[PDB]
Amino acid sequence: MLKPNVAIIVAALKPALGIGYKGKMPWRLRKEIRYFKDVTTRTTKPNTRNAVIMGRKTWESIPQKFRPLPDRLNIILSRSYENEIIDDNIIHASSIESSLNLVSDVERVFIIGGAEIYNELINNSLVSHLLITEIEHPSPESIEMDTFLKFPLESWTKQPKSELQKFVGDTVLEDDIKEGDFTYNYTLWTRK
Ligand SMILES: NC(=O)C1=CN([C@@H]2O[C@H](COP(=O)(O)OP(=O)(O)OC[C@H]3O[C@@H](n4cnc5c(N)ncnc54)[C@H](OP(=O)(O)O)[C@@H]3O)[C@@H](O)[C@H]2O)C=CC1
Numbered sequence: 001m002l003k004p005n006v007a008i009i010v011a012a013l014k015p016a017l018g019i020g021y022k023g024k025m026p027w028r029l030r031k032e033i034r035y036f037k038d039v040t041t042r043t044t045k046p047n048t049r050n051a052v053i054m055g056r057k058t059w060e061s062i063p064q065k066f067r068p069l070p071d072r073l074n075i076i077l078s079r080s081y082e083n084e085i086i087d088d089n090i091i092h093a094s095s096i097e098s099s100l101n102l103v104s105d106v107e108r109v110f111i112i113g114g115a116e117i118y119n120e121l122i123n124n125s126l127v128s129h130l131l132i133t134e135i136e137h138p139s140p141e142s143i144e145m146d147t148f149l150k151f152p153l154e155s156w157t158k159q160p161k162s163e164l165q166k167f168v169g170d171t172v173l174e175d176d177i178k179e180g181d182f183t184y185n186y187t188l189w190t191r192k
């Protein structure tokens with residue numbers, strides 16, 4: 001795969017864009033988790049799959065019985081990894097571009113975490129799309145949080161819902177989804 005268009009997909013709590021606490025997610029949003037599964041899995045043409053790329057810490061935070069994430073090519077980045085094809089579902093590498101070099105029959109490429117990876121790749125021109133689940137809470141400062149996105153969104157344009165709908169195909173997009181004290185919306189951003 002040469003110069004793939006890449007999408008960041010993330011769920012973040014406004015206004016600070018917190019995404020984690022001591023190596024874990026600060027919430028469990030069932031519908032959001034299903035959205036993530038559906039969007040990263042879905043392909044528009046037959047006989048392809050998508051790639052999901054993540055940092056070593058995020059990979060390790062998926063319980064071992066539940067990785068690799070099914071139906072997607074999983075790529076894990078570590079500074080200690082030489083290039084290695086582990087199996088048909090798992091690749092080890094030290095950059096996104098090198099990891100995708102011998103990869104074929106992949107449609108979309110998603111960056112799925114975590115903070116360090118997101119905060120590097122936001123300034124990688126291969127990333128053309130941000131799929132940000134914008135989470136709100138009445139008292140956001142009360143949620144324990146130590147891990148944040150550093151996204152210069154001034155350089156980005158939040159697209160209308162019609163663009164997000166086109167991107168996700170027939171995936172149902174509900175507005176102002178409420179779980180416990182959290183309210184959320186799915187968004188799509190592109191570069192200016
Ligand atoms: N809310 C959300 O949507 C999501 C939140 N998260 C959260 O993010 C947090 C995890 O993020 P974080 O701790 O930053 O860890 P990451 O998952 O980003 O992993 C960081 C590791 O990735 C490897 N890495 C980073 N940059 C490079 C590079 N340029 N080349 C090669 N390897 C690299 C390194 O591995 P090594 O040390 O092996 O060299 C590094 O230690 C957790 O709290 C998690 O719950 C995660 C996903 C989604």
Ligand SMILES: COc1cc(-c2ccccc2)ccc1[C@@H](C)C#Cc1c(C)nc(N)nc1N
Binds near residue numbers: 033036061062066112
């Ligand atoms: C380590 O963090 C996980 C654990 C699990 C998981 C899977 C099975 C059982 C338990 C946890 C799934 C996904 C993840 C991570 C990779 C995620 C995510 C994610 C989610 C959930 N939403 C959005 N919008 N973007 C994302 N990147």
